[PDB]
Each structure stands twice: as C-alpha cells, then as structure tokens.
C-alpha cells in the first residue's frame, strides 16, 4: 500500500518540523525543559514511531 506511506511520511515531515523548531525552543528557555519535558518525549516517541512505521510500510511496496 502506497497512499498510507505518503500520509505517514507527510506526518513525519510535520513532526520533524515540530522538533526542528520546538526542541531548541524548549531547551533554551529558562526552566522550559522541566515544564515541557513530557511534550518533547511525546514528540520524540511519535517521531521515532513514525520512522519505523514508514520503514515497515516500505517493505509492503
């Protein structure tokens, strides 16, 4: 299946754009990494999940 791979890869681009902007903002704000810790962990664990989804979906094409 091809179309769910392209949706999952578009989603990988938006999540990566959320990390390329957001993660340096969360880091270098004062006391921002303690407050926004679980957001970035949910962002990284989604980003890492989306990479292994697209790689497994590439096997089905």
């Amino acid at each position: 299946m091809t179309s769910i791979l392209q949706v999952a890869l578009l989603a990988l681009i938006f999540v990566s754009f959320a990390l390329v902007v957001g993660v340096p903002v969360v880091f270098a704000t004062p006391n921002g990494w303690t407050d926004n810790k679980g957001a970035v962990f949910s962002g990284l664990s989604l980003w890492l999940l989306l990479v292994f989804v697209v790689g497994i979906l590439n096997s089905f094409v």
Binding site: L5, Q6, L9, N58, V61
Partner: protein
Amino acid sequence: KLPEAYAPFAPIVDVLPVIPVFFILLAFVWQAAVSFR
C-alpha cells in the same frame, strides 16, 4: 530518480543539501541576536 512511492517528496529533497549552508548562517543570526557579545 527516487523510488516511485517517494517521488512526490522529491521537491523537498532538492532543498535538503543546501541546509548546512544555513547552519553556518544561523550562527551569525544567533550572534547578531545577542549583539555579538
């Protein structure tokens, strides 16, 4: 070309090599934002 399950993403790929030129420019923006301290 790319594999055809990824060829719609080929517009993003043409922008990807020039990105480390923007990383040396970002060090000048960050130092301009702290006024070159």
